[PDB]
């Protein structure tokens, strides 16, 4: 569920690139096991070990040893290191500033009649921000039997 | 990767590095000046 | 009310033909086109700032 | 305020400093030389009367102006 | 290479056949095999890949001939399938789009940010279950230990 | 459907009314809704910290 | 000189410059460009013919199977434009190529033609351009914005400043060809020319001169001059030149014949040169020490034993001077150099040239180009001769070769396409002289360096790309010599070509959604000039030379109309009169000025040739014969304008709108606005959403009509005639018989577009502005679309604004709008959303659109019909069910006590989940439409046939109405033919009408015409027959949906937004402001007459934001409505057409010498009452941009009404009834309503959806996701000590999955307190770090 493969509209799934990278590591690892248990010509075994090493490094930090691979749609597959680092990474963009509930947004106008501690909040924008408090206060005052 | 940063053409942002990786990349450069047969990628090796 | 004085090209190159008009009276085509230079430089600069 | 309202201050600073450096380039004081500091010839009365405190003849000024035009 | 070792242990001089034409037989076999096996995240078996390939090969043909485009009616015509498994085949062939697709938005957003969550129960629907637990504990308290115990147990 | 924002605060926000928008949040808990009352309130903040 | 439907509402035109050149077709760029593209002209003109001539024929690599190109054709579209808009498919035209494949069965002689295969293969569908220069690519309407990219040619840039940190400007030239390798000549901080072929190492600059077989001697003869020394009895006298010794320092005492001119140290005067010419001194005697430092010009050798005494580029010295005098040499030629003007650069660059002869030059070039390879004579000479000098590889195209010749001041406009040694040498010469001061570098933001592409050129380029891919693949196929068994169909594909042109028109940075909330948005987004996308710079790279406006923009690109913000100066927009050259450059017209008279013949000058001539100014009087009236006239010669002699100018400008775009021409009083204010004004005007009913500007600039007609929203006449039948849906035009073709009688018929959603969901619909039996003329407006009134662009409404504070309700830039403005519905807008309900096929089972929905009241299904979908016309509010749909869901595994609550009340658990399509929250509009698509071979429900039956009935009933129209017209023409010669008077009309096609007449050519009419009628019958058949077969076909879905139900909703506080309104002068109150009418500041102002605007926005245009337009609008109030009073207290005509004639002259000569005596008495009715609400007033009405004209027009000359009125408070001190400006100002509507900006959320991977608030209601509490806000809350606010703002309200559902309980339980826990962002980060090799753990 951190590298998920999710059903979209139309049956065409959606996957994070980590599945591609884990798959490329796993195929190459299984093939190295195969070739090792065939007594294969050791130059081919060298190539398999080298490719598996490159795959593990694309998995850990792509574009850090050679050129980013690849991706399947002609764009550099992002790896775990890319999942942490970068301006659009994880330490920065959902770790320090994230999306927030109980919040709205509207065009501000002036309204010079207000006292300096208060601001006009639309009724429609306030009935959505305080729905928990309103449900609680309704169920408390007995005006409504239950939360439903 | 050591810094300076390369471009193609008030350039005051920051340095980011370093006294540890500076001489590291400088050492790698001095060595790679003699790296003759050093493709260093799988498909060509 | 007064005059608009001397415009300036974006790289600081002050134009010698000065807009001797204000917005109350007209601005003919050439003076306006001269002023658009510094206008767009200022606009683009506050598009970065 | 609006993007057209700080752009004004930008353009204002720009033309102001431009005119400032250019009318500082002019010379208003008086130190009558009566002879160029490059070619030694007497700076004529006319040229030395237009710009008080001129320090070079006409042609030496043209030469140095061109040289600085290339920024060298 | 693995198929080549395979063919080298199965190459025969007794037919007097040159090595390349037969080892390349085995090699094309094994390479197409591994392509059909491990080239797609959601593994469709090899026969499904062959079927989508023959569908595609009869699709380019039916396009260049019929002008407009293939269709499941047309393809079930030209091919020998029942007009519905061809439907599911052409549903199957498409690749999962990457969840890091750069979306056409302002924040440099990606396709992985808009994939909502269909398993979570909304906190109005957990506070509409704890309220129900409290209500049933009340309404069961209004009852003998016979009914209360037997209903909590049943 | 438009927040009416007190005129004097607009120098604080650096905000005029040419179409600008603002975000509203609700300080939920007790300790968080005495901080909007005691620290982040509009009347306690009339001096610029600079 | 006004047509019949042109004295309806005549606009009193101020403006004194007569118009020499009427505004061209505004959409000319797009339309004629694609007409260039999809065109059959078999020559060198670009298009598809060019692409196929380029890529074909194809041949095998001596296998000789030639697949050659024969011809091609554009297959007609299978869907109409509107059906392509509806059914969600692009609007293409199949592209058939009659291809031919000759099998070269080669034995002899030299591969004769053996057998041939001709076949017509299909390769992609190319999208087509509609009548309005726009594409329909997926049902959406798109526009391919023209691109402005640099051109092939040679460019000299300096790279001043930051380079080298010594201050020294550098100077580099670049030859950038259309196709091949670049070629750079770069100076360097030590002055010596270099070379750099593409981006390789910088070889010296003499190496290429040597590669051209130039030895050192003629090289130094090329780049330098010559100083001559000879022993004329005194030790190598100098051969002196007068001019060359200017501005020098006296290296010695230059004297002659006893005449002492130059004393050494005494710097040279200009008097010195004047005297040296006044005496004519050429041979002089000099010190022998002067020749020491100079440089020889040719290799001086001796003849004793071939002694190489000195070679060229070898500086002399007194020892070598002795060696030169001893061997008896008289000639001593040296490079005349000097550090001011004749700088030594070739000399030093030879002294640093490590090469000496040609072949070493080639070998060093080779080691540069393809290193590692051991070079040789043959390979090196071949590499050089195939670098730039072989048509196979290099191509200076006609654009590039024109630029190249024109850039070096050549007169040949077209030469070779490959570089010559002459060309390269001349580039280096011009570069050295740009280093010398002779000339200065070009500004690469020039409009003479950047040429313009368009949709008819970029599409063709993508087609060439697809063609080259398919040609390589066809070579691959043909190389395997299969057999004669195949014609050129299986070797050719369509996925490549179709895919290339598709990925151009569908996903590109230049193929954008067309803006549609205006005639202005459409017509000014089809005229954009972007510098982004393919082949041009980008917002990332650029840049500040490109953002700016060069002097060459005058008449070519609007300097005031550009999208400000991120990409400003990157999306410049075309001007009004700007065409494109034959080469792609932007031309603007100038009236040729002969000897002294401005000839009325206009020349379209490009941006490169425009700097040579003295182009005059449009604000220039003329002595009624083309004669300038002033002594010296203001022109602009090379960028800088100035006063030039009257008999010196070569051109005059056409008009004064020649420099402002179409957008910035609709701004009254542009002359008086600060330029950034007009920029913001044009941009905001480009967003004025249409209103319920249109309203002409009370103050215009005359350009509204051109902009509205040139756009496509208006429905305008193809031929004049009489309007035979009007209707809300259609107009019918009995054509004037003169404009009627010989056969096929016919009468035109225009089916207007009623309500339909723009790209912005705003409403599109057309109203007939002509009444039954009204004479139309050709090129006239019959239907005024959205935002146009009688064919005049009308984005806003003229509201009575008073410039005054009023209690803070317009504080920063708010607008205080009265309640009569929302009462009278003069800013209500109609907005047409489209919702859709798709019934896909989930694994658990296909979904259904049944109206049996689980857990819903019997009021919720009141509006749905039997099959589930909503009724048409059902008024809806937020939450109502538009399309009841239920999905398969089984099982669910219900919990405990919910179990007991279903076992008690026995209400079963339904095996279906509710997922019906319901109206959004807040939206409230009638359902004006419902469209149901189905998968092919899926049972249409009861209500998908109530649409197709009605649709077939409508189609056949419309093609019946149209055939009755056409047959009525044909029978009318037949009867007219029988007016004489076969005239049956009164029972011909009684006879059977079918017994008219062959009636008895004098069988002259009249009977020929009648046989024409009869055969036309029968062809019309059959045409309507097959029209109805094809329409039926298209209506009754299974639509093709994307895979997985069965039926899509679309429901089009028509909400009516009303203006309210929060919404953003704006004048045209960039005075924006959100309307921040709706005042009762009795509070509005009214005047002594009693009338309330409608809008109240802050006065303080005029001085700071220097836009006097807005108050000037307040005054002129007050004048224009005052001239309308008098007309209205005269029209209600009926006087007669005489006195009303008198006043209108007064008000219509009313100015200085203006070209609006209108006289109300050529007007029929009832032609003056239509006019007098349409001037009842105020007369329009034209005011061309820099040719407007001057303030005296405004005051005079005020005095003609009965308003105060000061433009100011005393006004009383609406509330206290007292009089405002200091009278206020009150006038009618044209106010637009931008679609920054508050009904879209306002949203809010408490608990909604959450993302799946990063469990944060997601939303997706557009947008139910919460607000982004970014990083600066975290710092803002760390600044206060608000730790609890921050903590809940980043754990309980955002991320922590247990704490949030646990706190939603606590909020409801009356307990405001949280247990925060740990954010799933941090849990994910721990899992990812730990999923590396890093063990990261949490120490307890
Ligand atoms: C790159 C492109 C940018 C648009 C400019 C992005 C934006 C969203 C992407 C589409 C959506 O995922 C929906 C749909 C899902 C299917 O399963 C696969 C096809 C679709 C059409 C996607 C292809 C493409 O990737 C789209 C158009
Ligand atoms: C526009 C800007 C304010 C921005 C808000 C003000 C603040 C400081 C001003 C400069 C300095 O005073 C020094 C100097 C004084 C001379 O008198 C005129 C020129 C100079 C260069 C000034 C130009 C301009 O006026 C400046 C940038
Ligand atoms: C907002 C964005 C446009 C901005 C550029 C549009 C363009 C295509 C949209 C997605 C696709 O439709 C597939 C899918 C459909 C589901 O039903 C709802 C979710 C999905 C993931 C959509 C999210 C988002 O809405 C997308 C990215
Ligand atoms: C008689 C009159 C001309 C004057 C002689 C003819 C000319 C063409 C006729 C209209 C068209 O047929 C279209 C339409 C067909 C409907 O079915 C009935 C209504 C319409 C509007 C017709 C009414 C009328 O009949 C028209 C105006
Ligand atoms: Mg603002
Ligand atoms: Zn001097």
Asked whether G507 lines ligand 1 (CB < 6 A), one says: yes
CB within 8 Å: E67 and G1260: no
What is the secondary structure of G241-292 as a DSSP string? -TGGGTT---SS--EETTEE---TTSPPPHHHHHHHHHTT--EE---GGGGS
Task: Output the CA–CA distances (angstroms, integers) from residue A21 to A30, E34, E41, G619, in the order listed.
Answer: 14, 17, 11, 69
Dihedral (CA of G963, G968, G969, G973) sign: positive
Beta strands G1181-1182 and G12-13 are parallel
Beta strands in chain D (DSSP E): none
Query: Is residue E23 left, alpha or beta, with left meaning phi > 0 and alpha meaning psi from -120 to 50?
Result: alpha
Task: Give me the count of residues in chain G.
Answer: 1340
Q: List the subunits that have 3+ CB pairs under 8 angstroms with A.
A: B, E, F, G
Residue of E nearest to A79 (CA): E100
G1215 at interface of D, judged by CB pairs closer than 8 A = no
CB within 8 Å: A38 and E5: yes
Residues 6+ apart with CB under 8 A from G860: G853, G880, G881
D13 CA → ligand 2 middle, Å = 6
Closest to G44 in 3D by CA, of G35, G54, G34:
G54
Experimental method: cryo-EM
F30 at interface of A, judged by CB pairs closer than 8 A = no
What is the secondary structure of G877-934 as a DSSP string? -TT-EEE--EEE-------TTHHHHHHHS-----SEEE--EEPPSS--EEEEEEEEEE
Probe residue for ligand 3, chosen from E96, E101, E104, E114 as the CB with the greatest number of ligand atoms within 8 Å: E114
Closest to G127 in 3D by CA, of G82, G93, G76:
G93
Residue of A nearest to E126 (CA): A147
Contacts of A54 in chain B (CB under 8 A): 42
CB within 8 Å: E123 and G1247: yes
Q: Which two tokens stand for residue G1283?
A: 């730790």
Neighbours of G213 (CB within 10 A): 11
CB within 8 Å: G269 and D41: yes
Question: Smallest CA–CA separation between C40 and chain G, in Å?
Answer: 6
Probe residue for ligand 1, chosen from A8, A11, A75 as the CB with the greatest number of ligand atoms within 8 Å: A8
Contacts of C6 in chain D (CB under 8 A): 15, 19
Contacts of G1249 in chain E (CB under 8 A): 116-117
Closest partner CB to D15 (pick from C8, C45, C47): C8
Q: List the subunits that have 3+ CB pairs under 8 angstroms with B.
A: A
Question: Measured between alpha carbons, how far is G923 from G934 in angstroms, rounded to an integer?
Answer: 27
What is the secondary structure of B5-45 as a DSSP string? PP------S-----SSHHHHHHHHHHHHTS--S----TTT-
* Contact of G1215 with G1084, CB cutoff 8 Å: no
Question: Measured between alpha carbons, how far is G559 from G448 in angstroms, rounded to an integer?
Answer: 16
How many domains does one find in chain D?
Answer: 1
Query: Mapping DSSP to helix (H, G, I), strand (E, B) and coil, where does residue G446 land?
Result: coil
Residue of C nearest to D7 (CA): C42
What distance separates the 2 farthest-apart alpha carbons in chain C? 34
Neighbours of ion ligand 5 (CB under 5 A): F 18, 20
CB within 8 Å: G672 and C23: yes
Question: Smallest CA–CA separation between G627 and chain D, in Å?
Answer: 38
Name the residue at shortest CA distance from atom 16 of ligand 3: A9
Task: Check whether F20 is labelled as a binding-site residue.
Answer: yes
SS (H, E, C) G1119-1178: HHHHHHHHHHHHHHCCCCHHHHHHHHHHHHHCCCCCCCCCCCCCCCCCHHHHHHHHCCCC
Task: Give me the count of residues in chain E.
Answer: 154
Q: How many CA atoms lie within 13 A of G530 on its CB side?
A: 22
Angle at the Cα of G729 from the Cα atoms of G724 and G731, rounded to 5 degrees: 25
* Contact of C44 with C32, CB cutoff 8 Å: no
Angle at the Cα of C3 from the Cα atoms of C2 and C4, rounded to 5 degrees: 125
Residue numbers of G between 537 and 556 with CB closer than 8 Å to C: 544, 547-549, 553-554
Closest partner CB to D11 (pick from C14, C39, C47): C39
SS (H, E, C) G30-86: HHHHHHHHCCCCCCCCCCHHHHHHHHCCECCCCCCEEEEEEEEEECCCCCCHHHHHH
Asked whether A12 lines ligand 1 (CB < 6 A), one says: yes
Q: Which two tokens stand for residue G1164?
A: 């029929």
Name the residue at shortest CA distance from atom 1 of ligand 4: G968
CB within 8 Å: C27 and G559: no
CATH level 3 topology of G829-947+1045-1057: OB fold (Dihydrolipoamide Acetyltransferase, E2P) (2.40.50)
G1312 at interface of F, judged by CB pairs closer than 8 A = yes
G1003 CA → ligand 1 middle, Å = 69
Cis peptide before A61 (omega within 30 of 0): no
* Contact of G417 with G438, CB cutoff 8 Å: no
Query: Mapping DSSP to helix (H, G, I), strand (E, B) and coil, where does residue E41 land?
Result: coil
CB within 8 Å: D15 and C43: no
Closest partner CB to E100 (pick from A6, A17, A31): A17
Rounded to the nearest 5 percent, the helix, strand and coil shares of chain E are 60, 5, 35
D1 at interface of F, judged by CB pairs closer than 8 A = yes
Strand arrangement of the beta sheet that strand G65-74 belongs to:
G65-74, G92-103, G115-127
Resolution to one decimal, Å? 3.4
| Partner residues linked to G832 by β-bridges | G1054
Query: Mapping DSSP to helix (H, G, I), strand (E, B) and coil, where does residue G1311 land?
Result: coil
Closest to G783 in 3D by CA, of G721, G726, G867, G863:
G726
Angle at the Cα of G1102 from the Cα atoms of G1100 and G1103, rounded to 5 degrees: 80
Closest to G268 in 3D by CA, of D69, D70, D38, D65:
D38
Closest partner CB to D60 (pick from G266, G267, G680): G267
G1242 at interface of F, judged by CB pairs closer than 8 A = yes
Chain D interface, mutation test: which of C38, C39, C40, C49, most D Cβ atoms within 10 Å? Answer: C38
Q: How many CA atoms lie within 13 A of G711 on its CB side?
A: 31
Neighbours of G369 (CB within 10 A): 17
Task: Classify residue A66 as exposed, middle or buried by CB count within 10 Å of its CB (0-12, 13-18, 19+).
Answer: middle
Query: Mapping DSSP to helix (H, G, I), strand (E, B) and coil, where does residue C1 land?
Result: coil
Q: List the subunits that have 3+ CB pairs under 8 angstroms with D.
A: C, F, G
Closest partner CB to C28 (pick from G548, G619, G1190): G619
Contacts of C6 in chain G (CB under 8 A): none
Residue of A nearest to B44 (CA): A47
Residue of G nearest to C47 (CA): G565
| Partner residues linked to G1237 by β-bridges | none
Neighbours of G1159 (CB within 10 A): 9
Contacts of G634 in chain C (CB under 8 A): 30
For ligand 4, which residues put their CB under 6 angstroms from it?
Answer: G 724-725, 961, 964-965, 968
Neighbours of G778 (CB within 10 A): 14
Query: Mapping DSSP to helix (H, G, I), strand (E, B) and coil, where does residue G778 land?
Result: coil
Task: Output the CA–CA distances (angstroms, integers) from residue D19 to C17, C43, D13, D26, G897, in the order listed.
Answer: 13, 20, 10, 11, 84
* Contact of G608 with G616, CB cutoff 8 Å: no
Angle at the Cα of D50 from the Cα atoms of D47 and D55, rounded to 5 degrees: 55
Helices (H), G438-592: 455-479, 495-505, 519-525
The answer to whether C and F touch (≥3 CB pairs < 8 Å) is no
Question: Measured between alpha carbons, how far is G823 from G839 in angstroms, rounded to an integer?
Answer: 43
Domain residue limits at D6: 1-72
Closest to G1108 in 3D by CA, of G678, G631, G642:
G678
Residue of F nearest to A129 (CA): F26
G237 CA → ligand 6 middle, Å = 29
CB within 8 Å: G680 and D4: yes
Query: Mapping DSSP to helix (H, G, I), strand (E, B) and coil, where does residue G726 land?
Result: coil
- C-alpha gyration radius of chain E: 30
Q: How far apart are the first and last CA of chain G?
A: 94
| Partner residues linked to G69 by β-bridges | G99
């Amino acid at each position: 569920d951190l590298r998920p493969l999710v059903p979209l509209d139309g049956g065409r799934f959606a996957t994070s690139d980590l599945n591609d990278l884990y798959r490329r590591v796993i195929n190459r690892n299984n093939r190295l096991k195969r070739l090792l248990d065939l007594a294969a010509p050791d130059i081919i075994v060298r190539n398999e070990k080298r490719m598996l090493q490159e795959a593990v490094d694309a998995l850990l930090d792509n574009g850090r040893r050679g050129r980013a691979i690849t991706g399947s749609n002609k764009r550099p597959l992002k790896s775990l290191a890319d999942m942490i680092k970068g301006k659009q990474g994880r330490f920065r963009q959902n770790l320090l500033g994230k999306r927030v509930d109980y919040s709205g947004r509207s065009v501000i106008t002036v309204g010079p009649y207000l006292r300096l501690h208060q601001c006009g909040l639309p009724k429609k924008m306030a009935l959505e921000l305080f729905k928990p408090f309103i449900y609680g206060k309704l169920e408390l005052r007995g005006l409504a039997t239950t939360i439903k | 990767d050591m810094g300076i940063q390369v471009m193609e053409e008030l350039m005051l942002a920051e340095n980011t590095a370093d006294e540890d990786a500076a001489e590291a990349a400088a050492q790698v450069l001095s060595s790679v000046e003699s790296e003759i047969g050093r493709t260093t990628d799988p498909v060509r090796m | 009310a007064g005059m608009r004085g001397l415009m300036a090209k974006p790289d600081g190159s002050i134009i010698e033909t000065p807009i001797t008009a204000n917005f109350r009276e007209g601005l003919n085509v050439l003076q306006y086109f001269i002023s658009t230079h510094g206008a767009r430089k200022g606009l683009a600069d506050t598009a970065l700032k | 305020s609006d993007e057209a309202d700080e752009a004004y201050s930008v353009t204002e600073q720009l033309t102001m400093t431009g005119i400032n450096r250019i009318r500082q380039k002019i010379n208003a004081h008086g130190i009558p030389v009566y002879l160029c500091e490059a070619c030694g010839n007497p700076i004529p009365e006319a040229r030395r009367k237009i710009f008080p405190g001129v320090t070079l003849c006409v042609e030496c000024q043209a030469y140095q102006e061109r040289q600085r035009k290339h920024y060298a | 290479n693995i198929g080549l070792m395979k063919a080298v242990d199965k190459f025969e001089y007794r037919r007097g056949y040159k090595f390349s034409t037969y080892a390349t037989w085995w090699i094309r076999q094994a390479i197409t095999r591994s392509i059909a096996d491990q080239a797609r995240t959601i593994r469709i078996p090899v026969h499904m890949i062959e079927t989508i390939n023959k569908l595609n090969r009869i699709s380019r043909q039916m396009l260049q001939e019929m002008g407009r485009e293939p269709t499941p009616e047309e393809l079930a015509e030209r091919m020998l399938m029942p007009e519905d498994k061809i439907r599911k085949v052409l549903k199957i062939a498409k690749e999962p789009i990457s969840m890091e697709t750069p979306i056409g938005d302002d924040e440099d957003s990606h396709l992985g940010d808009f994939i909502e969550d269909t398993t979570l129960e909304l906190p109005l629907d957990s506070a509409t279950t704890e309220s129900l637990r409290a209500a049933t504990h009340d309404v069961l308290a209004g009852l003998t230990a016979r009914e209360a115990k037997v209903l909590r147990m049943r | 459907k438009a927040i009416q924002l007190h005129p004097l605060v607009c120098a604080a926000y650096n905000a005029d009314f040419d179409g600008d928008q603002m975000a509203v949040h609700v300080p939920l808990t007790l300790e968080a809704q005495l901080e909007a009352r005691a620290l982040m309130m509009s009347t306690n903040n009339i001096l610029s910290p600079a | 000189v006004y047509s019949y439907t042109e004295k309806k509402r005549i606009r009193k035109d101020f403006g004194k410059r007569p118009q020499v050149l009427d505004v061209p077709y505004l959409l000319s760029i797009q339309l004629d460009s694609f007409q260039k593209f999809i065109e059959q002209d078999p020559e060198g003109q670009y298009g598809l013919e060019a692409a196929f001539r380029s890529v074909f024929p194809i041949q095998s690599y001596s296998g000789n199977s030639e697949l050659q190109y024969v011809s091609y054709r554009l297959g007609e579209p299978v869907f109409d434009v509107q059906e392509c808009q509806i059914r969600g498919v692009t609007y293409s035209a199949p592209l058939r190529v009659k291809l031919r494949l000759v099998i070269y069965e080669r034995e002899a002689p030299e591969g004769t033609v053996k057998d041939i295969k001709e076949q017509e293969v299909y390769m992609g569908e190319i999208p087509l351009m509609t009548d309005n220069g726009t594409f329909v690519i997926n049902g959406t309407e798109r526009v391919i914005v023209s691109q402005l990219h640099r051109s092939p040619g040679v460019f000299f840039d300096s790279d001043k400043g930051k380079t080298h940190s010594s201050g020294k400007v550098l100077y580099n030239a670049r030859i950038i060809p259309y196709r091949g390798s670049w070629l750079d000549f770069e100076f360097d901080p030590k002055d010596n020319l270099f070379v750099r072929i593409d981006r390789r190492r910088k070889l010296p600059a003499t190496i290429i001169l040597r590669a051209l077989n130039y030895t050192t001697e003629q090289i130094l003869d090329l780049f330098f001059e010559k100083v001559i020394f000879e022993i004329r009895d005194n030790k190598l006298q100098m051969e002196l030149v007068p001019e060359r010794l200017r501005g020098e320092t006296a290296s010695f005492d230059i004297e002659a014949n006893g005449k002492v001119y130059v004393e050494k140290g005494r710097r040279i005067t200009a008097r010195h040169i004047r005297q040296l010419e006044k005496d004519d001194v050429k041979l002089i005697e000099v010190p022998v020490e002067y020749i020491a430092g100079k440089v020889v010009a040719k290799d001086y050798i001796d003849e004793s034993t071939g002694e190489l005494i000195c070679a060229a580029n070898m500086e002399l010295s007194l020892d070598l001077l002795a060696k030169l005098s001893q061997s008896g040499h008289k000639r001593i030629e040296t490079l005349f150099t000097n550090d001011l003007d004749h700088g030594p650069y070739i000399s030093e660059t030879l002294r640093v040239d490590p090469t000496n002869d040609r072949l070493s030059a080639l070998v060093e070039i080779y080691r540069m180009m393809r290193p590692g390879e051991p070079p040789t004579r043959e390979a090196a000479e071949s590499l050089f001769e195939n670098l730039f000098f072989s048509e196979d590889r290099y191509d200076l195209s006609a654009v590039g070769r024109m630029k190249f010749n024109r850039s070096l001041l050549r007169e040949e406009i077209e030469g070779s396409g490959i570089l010559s040694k002459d060309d390269i040498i001349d580039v280096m010469k011009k570069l050295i002289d740009i280093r010398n001061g002779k000339g200065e570098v070009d500004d690469i933001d020039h409009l003479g360096n950047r040429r313009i592409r368009s949709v008819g050129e970029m599409a063709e380029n993508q087609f060439r790309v697809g063609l080259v891919r398919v040609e390589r693949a066809v070579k691959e196929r043909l190389s395997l010599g299969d057999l004669d068994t195949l014609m050129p169909q299986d070797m050719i594909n369509a996925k490549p070509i179709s895919a290339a042109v598709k990925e151009f028109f569908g996903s590109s940075q230049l193929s954008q959604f067309m803006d549609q909330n205006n005639p202005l948005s459409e017509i000014t987004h089809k005229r954009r000039i972007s510098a982004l996308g393919p082949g041009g710079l980008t917002r990332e790279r650029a840049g500040f030379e490109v953002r700016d406006v060069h002097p060459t923009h005058y008449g070519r690109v609007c300097p005031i109309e550009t999208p400000e913000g991120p990409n400003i100066g990157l999306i410049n927009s075309l001007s009004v009169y700007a065409q494109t050259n034959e080469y792609g450059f932007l031309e603007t017209p100038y009236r040729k000025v002969t000897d002294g008279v401005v000839t009325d013949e206009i020349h379209y000058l490009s941006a490169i040739e425009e700097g040579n001539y003295v182009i005059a100014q449009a604000n220039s009087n003329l002595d009624e014969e083309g004669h300038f009236v002033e002594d010296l006239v203001t022109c602009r010669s090379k960028g800088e304008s100035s006063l030039f002699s009257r008999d010196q100018v070569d051109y005059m400008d056409v008009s004064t709108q020649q420099v402002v775009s179409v957008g910035a021409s609709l701004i009254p009083f542009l002359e008086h606005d600060d330029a950034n204010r007009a920029l913001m004004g044009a941009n905001m005007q480009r967003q004025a959403v249409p209103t319920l009913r249109a309203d002409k500007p009370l103050v215009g600039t005359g350009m509204e009509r051109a902009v509205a007609v040139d756009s496509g929203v208006t429905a305008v006449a193809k031929r004049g005639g009489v309007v035979q039948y009007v209707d809300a849906s259609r107009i019918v035009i009995k054509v004037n018989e003169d404009e009627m073709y010989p056969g096929e009688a016919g009468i035109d018929i225009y089916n207007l577009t009623k309500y339909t959603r723009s790209n912005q969901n705003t409403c599109i619909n057309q109203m007939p502005c002509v009444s039954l039996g009204e004479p139309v003329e050709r090129g006239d407006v019959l239907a005024d679309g959205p935002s146009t009134d009688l064919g005049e662009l009308a984005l806003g409404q003229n509201m009575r604004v008073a410039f005054m504070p009023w209690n803070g309700y317009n504080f920063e830039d708010s607008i205080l709008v009265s309640e009569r403005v929302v009462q009278e519905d003069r800013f209500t807008t109609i907005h047409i959303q489209e919702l859709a309900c798709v019934s896909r096929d989930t694994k658990l089972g296909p979904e259904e659109i049944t109206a049996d929905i689980p857990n819903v009241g019997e009021a919720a299904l009141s509006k749905l019909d039997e099959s589930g979908i909503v009724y048409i016309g059902a008024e809806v509010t937020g939450g109502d069910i538009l399309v009841g749909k239920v999905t398969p869901k089984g099982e669910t595994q219900l919990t405990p006590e919910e179990k007991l609550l279903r076992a008690i009340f026995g209400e079963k658990a339904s095996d279906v989940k509710d997922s019906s399509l319901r109206v959004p929250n807040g939206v409230s509009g009638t359902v004006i439409d419902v469209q149901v698509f189905t998968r092919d071979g899926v049972e249409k429900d009861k209500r998908a046939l109530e649409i197709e039956e009605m649709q077939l009935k409508q189609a056949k009933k419309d093609l019946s109405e149209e055939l009755q129209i056409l047959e009525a017209g044909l029978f009318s023409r037949i009867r007219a033919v029988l007016v004489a010669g076969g005239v049956e008077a009164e029972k011909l009309d009684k006879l059977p009408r079918d017994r008219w096609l062959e009636l008895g007449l004098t069988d002259e050519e009249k009977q020929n015409q009648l046989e024409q009419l009869a055969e036309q009628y029968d062809e019309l019958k059959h045409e309507f027959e097959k029209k109805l058949e094809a329409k039926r077969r298209k209506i009754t076909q299974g639509d093709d949906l994307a895979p997985g879905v069965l039926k899509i139900v679309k429901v089009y909703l028509a909400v009516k937004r009303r203006i309210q506080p929060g919404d953003k309104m704006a004048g045209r002068h960039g005075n924006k402001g959100v309307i921040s109150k709706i005042n009762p009418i009795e509070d509005m500041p009214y005047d002594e007459n009693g009338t309330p102002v409608d809008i109240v605007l802050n006065p303080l926005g005029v001085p700071s934001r220097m836009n006097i245009g807005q108050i000037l337009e307040t005054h002129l609008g007050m004048a224009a409505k005052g001239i309308g109030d008098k007309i209205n009073a005269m029209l209600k207290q009926q006087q007669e057409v005489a006195k009303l005509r008198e006043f209108i004639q007064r008000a219509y002259d009313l100015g200085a010498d203006v070209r609006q000569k209108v006289d109300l005596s050529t007007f029929s008495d009832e032609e003056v009452m239509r006019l007098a009715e349409n001037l009842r609400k105020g007369m329009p007033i034209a005011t061309p941009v820099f040719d407007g009405a001057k303030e005296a004209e405004i005051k005079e027009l005020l005095k003609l009404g009965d308003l105060p000359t000061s433009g100011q009125i005393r006004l009383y408070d609406g509330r206290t009834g007292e009089q405002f001190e200091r009278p206020v400006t009150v006038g009618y100002m044209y106010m637009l309503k931008l679609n920054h509507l508050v009904d879209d900006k306002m949203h809010a959320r408490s608990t909604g959806s959450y993302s799946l991977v990063t469990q944060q608030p997601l939303g997706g209601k557009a947008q139910f996701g919460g607000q982004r509490f970014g990083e600066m806000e975290v710092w803002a809350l760390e600044a206060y000590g608000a730790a609890y606010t921050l903590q809940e703002m980043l754990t309980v309200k955002s991320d922590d999955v247990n704490g949030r559902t646990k706190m939603y309980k606590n909020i409801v339980d009356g307990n405001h307190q949280m247990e925060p826990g740990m954010p799933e962002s941090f849990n994910v980060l721990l899992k990812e770090i730990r999923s590396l090799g890093i063990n990261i753990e949490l120490e307890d």
